Amino acid sequence: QAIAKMRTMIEGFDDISHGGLPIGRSTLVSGTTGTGKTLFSIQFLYNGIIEFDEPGVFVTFEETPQDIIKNARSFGWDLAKLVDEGKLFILDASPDPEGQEVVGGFDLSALIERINYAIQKYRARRVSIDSVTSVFQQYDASSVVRRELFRLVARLKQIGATTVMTTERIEEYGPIARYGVEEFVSDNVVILRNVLEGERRRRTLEILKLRGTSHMKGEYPFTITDHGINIFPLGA
Amino acid sequence: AIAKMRTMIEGFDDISHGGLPIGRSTLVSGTTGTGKTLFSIQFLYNGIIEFDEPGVFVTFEETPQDIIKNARSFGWDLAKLVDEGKLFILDASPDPELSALIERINYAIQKYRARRVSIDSVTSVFQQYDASSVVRRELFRLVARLKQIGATTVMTTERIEEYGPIARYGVEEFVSDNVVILRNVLEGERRRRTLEILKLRGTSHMKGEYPFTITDHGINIFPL
Amino acid sequence: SEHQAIAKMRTMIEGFDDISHGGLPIGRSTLVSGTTGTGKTLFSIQFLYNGIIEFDEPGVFVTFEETPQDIIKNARSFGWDLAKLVDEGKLFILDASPDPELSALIERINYAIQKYRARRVSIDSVTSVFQQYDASSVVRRELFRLVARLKQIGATTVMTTERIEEYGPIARYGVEEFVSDNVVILRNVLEGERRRRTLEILKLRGTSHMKGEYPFTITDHGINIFPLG
Amino acid sequence: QAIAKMRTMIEGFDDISHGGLPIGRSTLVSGTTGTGKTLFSIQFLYNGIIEFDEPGVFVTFEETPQDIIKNARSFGWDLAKLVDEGKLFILDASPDPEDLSALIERINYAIQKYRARRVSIDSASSVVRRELFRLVARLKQIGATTVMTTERIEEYGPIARYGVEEFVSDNVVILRNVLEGERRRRTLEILKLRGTSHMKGEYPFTITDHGINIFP
Amino acid sequence: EHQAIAKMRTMIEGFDDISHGGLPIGRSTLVSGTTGTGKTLFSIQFLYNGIIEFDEPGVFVTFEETPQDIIKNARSFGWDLAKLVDEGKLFILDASPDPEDLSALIERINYAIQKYRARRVSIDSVTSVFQQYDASSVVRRELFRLVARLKQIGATTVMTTERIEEYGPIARYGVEEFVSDNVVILRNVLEGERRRRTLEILKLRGTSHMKGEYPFTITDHGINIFP
Amino acid sequence: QAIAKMRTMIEGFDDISHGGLPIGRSTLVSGTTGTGKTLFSIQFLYNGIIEFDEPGVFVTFEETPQDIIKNARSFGWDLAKLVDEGKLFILDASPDPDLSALIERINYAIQKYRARRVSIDSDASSVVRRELFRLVARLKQIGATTVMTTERIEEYGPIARYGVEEFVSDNVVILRNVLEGERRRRTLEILKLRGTSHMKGEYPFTITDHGINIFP
Ligand SMILES: Nc1ncnc2c1ncn2[C@@H]1O[C@H](COP(=O)(O)OP(=O)(O)NP(=O)(O)O)[C@@H](O)[C@H]1O
Ligand SMILES: Nc1ncnc2c1ncn2[C@@H]1O[C@H](COP(=O)(O)OP(=O)(O)NP(=O)(O)O)[C@@H](O)[C@H]1O
Ligand SMILES: Nc1ncnc2c1ncn2[C@@H]1O[C@H](COP(=O)(O)OP(=O)(O)O)[C@@H](O)[C@H]1O
Ligand SMILES: Nc1ncnc2c1ncn2[C@@H]1O[C@H](COP(=O)(O)OP(=O)(O)O)[C@@H](O)[C@H]1O
Ligand SMILES: Nc1ncnc2c1ncn2[C@@H]1O[C@H](COP(=O)(O)OP(=O)(O)O)[C@@H](O)[C@H]1O
Ligand SMILES: Nc1ncnc2c1ncn2[C@@H]1O[C@H](COP(=O)(O)OP(=O)(O)O)[C@@H](O)[C@H]1O
Ligand SMILES: [Cl-]
Ligand SMILES: [Cl-]
Ligand SMILES: [Cl-]
Ligand SMILES: [Cl-]
Ligand SMILES: [Cl-]
Ligand SMILES: [Cl-]
Ligand SMILES: [Mg+2]
Ligand SMILES: [Mg+2]
Ligand SMILES: [Mg+2]
Ligand SMILES: [Mg+2]
Ligand SMILES: [Mg+2]
Ligand SMILES: [Mg+2]
């Protein structure tokens, strides 16, 4: 009765992970700016819908929904259509253009409930939470958001949602995650890197850990192309 | 594909696969004397001269007098463009002796019908001690308004190591759509300038570092 | 070996009893420190599991991170049925994990140890209760009250701790090596895009032991260590 | 109308800077201890007086005027003679062996009094940035061409002390004294000259009986 | 008298050669090193050899470990410390943390030295006493008060303390500022995946010594160096 | 009339400093523990007395006078005799088991003993910089030639501990004890001498029964 996995259908990832992401748990995807974390979290939901008719909920802390949609057009992923069809729900949690300092955790209490009803309403099995770093920066990484983040993770587990959460790190080789996000999103960790090779950049993906199950180890090269992420498990 | 505006900075539109996405902001970050101000001036100058797209330059530390003077190093006559109403330099530099400023920047953009905006040294208004939440929200307020207005913006930021964080306060990469890094790396005893587009949302682009020079004609980048 | 001063119990974790020259010192505590995903929880589960299966020695597992349910689910990765051992009274999993929405815990632990007549104890991620900037004196005294009680009871204890870098301090709070009798380090070193797992016994009070790093794997049978020499 | 420059006449520097220091602006000269900062700032003034009859003001915060004068004897320069002729003024802003608005109009008074064209100023990051910003602006309005020295503690670390001084400076020169394999090597770099060209990278120099000698 | 400082033999094989005669008499020597380098072993061997070889009584002040554990672990080297305690030649002074006023502590150390007529003293884990008071400079020059007082009685003292890196600062918390006369560094260096133990005498005020690192092993007879 | 020097009579040191230590000024001697700083400062005073009959004052903050005397017996030097003769004074400022008060004690000793040589053995950087500058300023005003030691943590790292001590000193000497391949190598470097020339980089030295011997 060891943990089962959900296929991401992201080229090469299901091989590295030996079958996909552990079902009903959160996986942290951490990486410097521009490593492809958001793209990964979108491809996860998009493939869920197209391949499996599994609805997805995308919670956005950094980008607006309109920009999420616009930026995916270059891959030929018609997110607007999936939203119109009710297969994808983009929950806008991104900063107020007229944002001010507010007190409490009522806003993140209401967020978790908003996320829960979205999941219920759209019958979603897949969830992406994009840019945990950003909501941490909204509350100066106070123990208030740390607690709420933990509450969010537990609720998702309680719901049975399979979740990707993305988060920033500052160096290619250094800590797993800025603000130690892996403490709360702790079951599974994937690290994306964008490493200088001479003057060129080489992207790699690593599954550092998946609790309760097996996976390939170390870094595997990938590219981002017109079809999104392509990872090469046998790549040079 | 998303619509891009040509910078006409030699080499840059090839590296960005057509120029800067219209209606969005781009961070240009670098150590001192890497060519950030020059990039942001050239962006406006070319827009006016080649495409008749008016420009607003917001300066937070250099005075407009020095901006105009330093631009004559490249044979650019910015005073003439200001006299013609094609360029507006907005002085936000401090007296030797931000919400409000945002409305003034809005006003200038509509008044001059500007499509291009450059913001130089905006983080000099903050202080080392400020909470990241405050710095981020105050910067975001400005950038969100520019996006709402339709402007395409270059915003310069500072860094203190050539390989190290993107910018000084650790929030700047979250407020802009795109990220460009200018470097000035020591190789033995020689300096080499490079430009890298680190992040360009919604499009492919050339990756890694590309050498450039600053000459009498401004920035020239060599992608091959 | 016969001629060493400290009595030891066998972990039965393949290769560890060779590296430690007989197993873990009885009645004492052993720190197992490592970056995240090095095998700390697996080591501390395997210790209890083997004690029950091989020697019928009951065990108490104190969890600060994972829920008991997840401990049990994850252990199925290795074909271990922990729920059955809990139902039989041979294993007790003590939940000290964060509630969504230390003296007290010590008494609960002591009660569980006497109730289940446990000889083996694993404390997993105890330093997760502390805050990053809590005083060193505070963290050391808190850990020590726990560990001294366990020694007084006569339990043999594995206590896991976190570290941030593979080559760097023994543990995160810089006091952990002072409350423990023995120190073991698990590493997961990344070099040339490949990871390799190793185990080292850094300090074992009162006896010799093999020195340096030894390779190990995690497979469907748990930890396997390969001691060369 | 691109910025004009003033010749330093420091052997090799006017080649590296394509003509000297930008007129009416301040140039930061930063370096670890004993890199030659005070020497550069004195040669600047000295050559101004001797070669071009341009009066100079030297602002000192730690070294006494007499120590400054004494040390310049090392290079065969008679500063006391120039002070007696009124072609050099050393301004003593040192503390006593038991507020920059004040110091500034002291400098300004001295500039107007001695008809000075060259100034040298020898030796919480938010407040330093703002304070150096204001000092730079005040000298610019007076029309002085200024060398200001600053300290740093590593050869390839921060340019100055707080990581901000280089950003608020129009011009930046870095003096290094790098230790490699038990040997020292002095170099000068013009890192930035806003609004004009200059040679790039480090150039070796020596300090001898004649002052700084740079080899382009 | 009017002579250079004299030394007392440790009888730790190899060490009396490296130190040209032993530890400077009537002064403190800091022995620093990462966890598990052999500091406590050095400090016990020093006292044990004094008792067995010279009939010089010893006092062992313990800040980290319990006396029961110190005695039990010393059996690893064939040393019967309980017998020496029973015979009054060794006193172990317990200052380890309670499982639940340092001026008073110094006075008890003094009293013990006088009661047992000890000529050798070991102070184990200065780092630990620092962690109990959070490196407040109340512990720091209460430490100097201890070093001073030891020097007044003419005790010859080993003080052990922790460091974090093999090639980095001499001692965590800057302990070498107080136990400043003599400094010995024990290292456990990683050579690939193997460990190599070394001992260095960094400094002995007022006298000569060999320089750099010397490898050693820990055996069933304690520390064994070879120059 | 450039700055003159007084001989240390460590023959290698007077060779690389071209004559000795600059007269009437303070020289910072920095190094990790056990590099020979105290020995350098004592040898400076001892040679001054034995070779030139220049009395000396040694100011101690850590070691007791009795220990300074005992330790010097390692080199066959009888400092108790020199104290008894009134050629040397060891001023005890070490703590029991106010910068102005210390300075007046130093001044009083220099007058009492007619001393020409002084050695001084051993939070905010601003405070340190200002106190150290006042100490240095008074000694210079008194006429003393001073060696002042400081500690540092790394062989190749900051010169002293507050990042300011080296900028307040006229002269800087760095002692190193570098560990490489399990062996130690001692070196001495004159980093800076204001107003005068000197050899550059690291020079090997040893400490023997004879004290410091430098071998260019
Ligand atoms: N005509 C020219 N020819 C060559 N290089 C020039 C010319 N004019 C200016 N420069 C260079 O351009 C640099 C100034 O670039 P600038 O855009 O001011 O940099 P920055 O990154 O904004 N630096 P700062 O804001 O001062 O930290 C100077 O340091 C010169 O090296
Ligand atoms: N006649 C000379 N020949 C050679 N070198 C000399 C001569 N006179 C002085 N020097 C050198 O000049 C250096 C002093 O330069 P100086 O301009 O005082 O440096 P600085 O960078 O201002 N140091 P500081 O202000 O104390 O941090 C000395 O350390 C000597 O190495
Ligand atoms: N059509 C495309 N082809 C290739 N690369 C693309 C395309 N669209 C976007 N990208 C790349 O994706 C990057 C942004 O990925 P994203 O997932 O937003 O990064 P982050 O890790 O910062 O979340 C851009 O910097 C660009 O390099
Ligand atoms: N059946 C299996 N085969 C191989 N590896 C496994 C298996 N089950 C778990 N693992 C590995 O064990 C690791 C779990 O380690 P864990 O003990 O939870 O680490 P820690 O407690 O140090 O964070 C996983 O990250 C995974 O790599
Ligand atoms: N009989 C023995 N043979 C070899 N090594 C031993 C023996 N007994 C103990 N040890 C070693 O002694 C080390 C502990 O020494 P200790 O002096 O307590 O270290 P420290 O005080 O520096 O942490 C143990 O980690 C083990 O390596
Ligand atoms: N007779 C001697 N022969 C060789 N070396 C000696 C002699 N006497 C003392 N030393 C050395 O001098 C060093 C003491 O130097 P010292 O000036 O006290 O160092 P610091 O003040 O830099 O800590 C001792 O560590 C020892 O190596
Ligand atoms: Cl790619
Ligand atoms: Cl260039
Ligand atoms: Cl493995
Ligand atoms: Cl030179
Ligand atoms: Cl050994
Ligand atoms: Cl030597
Ligand atoms: Mg993203
Ligand atoms: Mg600029
Ligand atoms: Mg674990
Ligand atoms: Mg100077
Ligand atoms: Mg010990
Ligand atoms: Mg000393």
Side-chain angles (χ1 to χ4, degrees), chain E:
Chain E
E1 202 143 322
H2 301 352
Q3 297 202 304
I5 191 158
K7 295 160 173 176
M8 69 159 51
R9 310 192 166 278
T10 66
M11 305 300 296
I12 299 176
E13 233 177 312
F15 182 84
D16 291 341
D17 295 327
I18 297 169
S19 58
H20 297 159
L23 293 178
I25 300 186
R27 295 185 177 178
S28 284
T29 297
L30 182 70
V31 175
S32 71
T34 51
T35 303
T37 39
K39 302 179 300 288
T40 295
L41 171 60
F42 189 99
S43 76
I44 297 172
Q45 196 161 356
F46 171 59
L47 294 192
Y48 180 83
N49 286 345
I51 294 164
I52 297 302
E53 305 284 341
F54 301 111
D55 195 28
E56 283 163 13
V59 173
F60 188 93
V61 175
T62 181
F63 284 109
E64 182 177 0
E65 320 189 9
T66 69
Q68 306 82 288
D69 281 339
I70 292 289
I71 289 166
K72 173 63 171 298
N73 292 334
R75 297 187 168 106
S76 187
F77 313 101
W79 303 333
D80 188 348
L81 303 189
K83 180 187 178 192
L84 300 182
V85 172
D86 289 334
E87 292 175 347
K89 303 177 181 175
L90 172 71
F91 181 70
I92 302 173
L93 191 151
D94 190 358
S96 60
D98 182 44
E100 268 157 9
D101 198 1
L102 227 67
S103 276
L105 170 137
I106 299 186
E107 299 301 327
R108 299 206 305 110
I109 300 190
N110 182 85
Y111 181 81
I113 289 167
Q114 293 178 336
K115 177 171 183 179
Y116 294 91
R117 303 193 170 262
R119 283 245 198 135
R120 308 190 178 212
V121 179
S122 288
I123 313 275
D124 193 47
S125 194
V126 181
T127 316
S128 284
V129 42
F130 264 63
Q131 293 197 331
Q132 295 342 317
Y133 295 93
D134 293 299
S136 64
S137 293
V138 185
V139 65
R140 300 200 1 110
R141 312 248 217 187
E142 197 67 33
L143 177 55
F144 180 47
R145 221 195 312 290
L146 177 68
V147 177
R149 268 277 260 164
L150 289 169
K151 177 167 288 181
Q152 294 180 59
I153 330 164
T156 299
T157 304
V158 168
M159 300 206 189
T160 68
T161 208
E162 192 200 33
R163 57 202 289 261
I164 299 316
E165 299 169 321
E166 302 302 328
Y167 295 101
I170 293 165
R172 200 170 163 191
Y173 304 116
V175 179
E176 86 270 28
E177 303 156 15
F178 310 102
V179 200
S180 212
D181 280 342
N182 311 303
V183 177
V184 174
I185 298 164
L186 308 184
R187 291 180 178 92
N188 194 18
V189 52
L190 265 175
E191 295 284 0
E193 288 174 341
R194 302 276 66 71
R195 290 275 183 184
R196 169 180 175 84
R197 306 190 181 278
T198 66
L199 175 154
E200 166 171 34
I201 302 184
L202 178 65
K203 174 175 185 177
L204 293 189
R205 277 189 182 142
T207 192
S208 63
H209 58 94
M210 297 182 190
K211 313 298 199 306
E213 299 176 66
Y214 293 90
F216 73 96
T217 57
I218 299 175
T219 70
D220 288 341
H221 303 288
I223 287 167
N224 185 255
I225 321 165
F226 34 98

Side-chain angles (χ1 to χ4, degrees), chain B residues 193 212-214, chain D residues 200:
Chain B
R193 308 184 182 279
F212 75 91
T213 57
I214 299 172
Chain D
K200 314 295 196 315

Side-chain angles (χ1 to χ4, degrees), chain B residues 36-37 62 120-121, chain D residues 194:
Chain B
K36 303 180 303 299
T37 298
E62 289 194 67
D120 195 13
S121 314
Chain D
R194 283 186 178 144

Side-chain angles (χ1 to χ4, degrees), chain A residues 220-231:
Chain A
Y220 297 93
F222 75 93
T223 57
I224 302 170
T225 64
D226 281 339
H227 302 295
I229 289 170
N230 261 251
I231 308 142

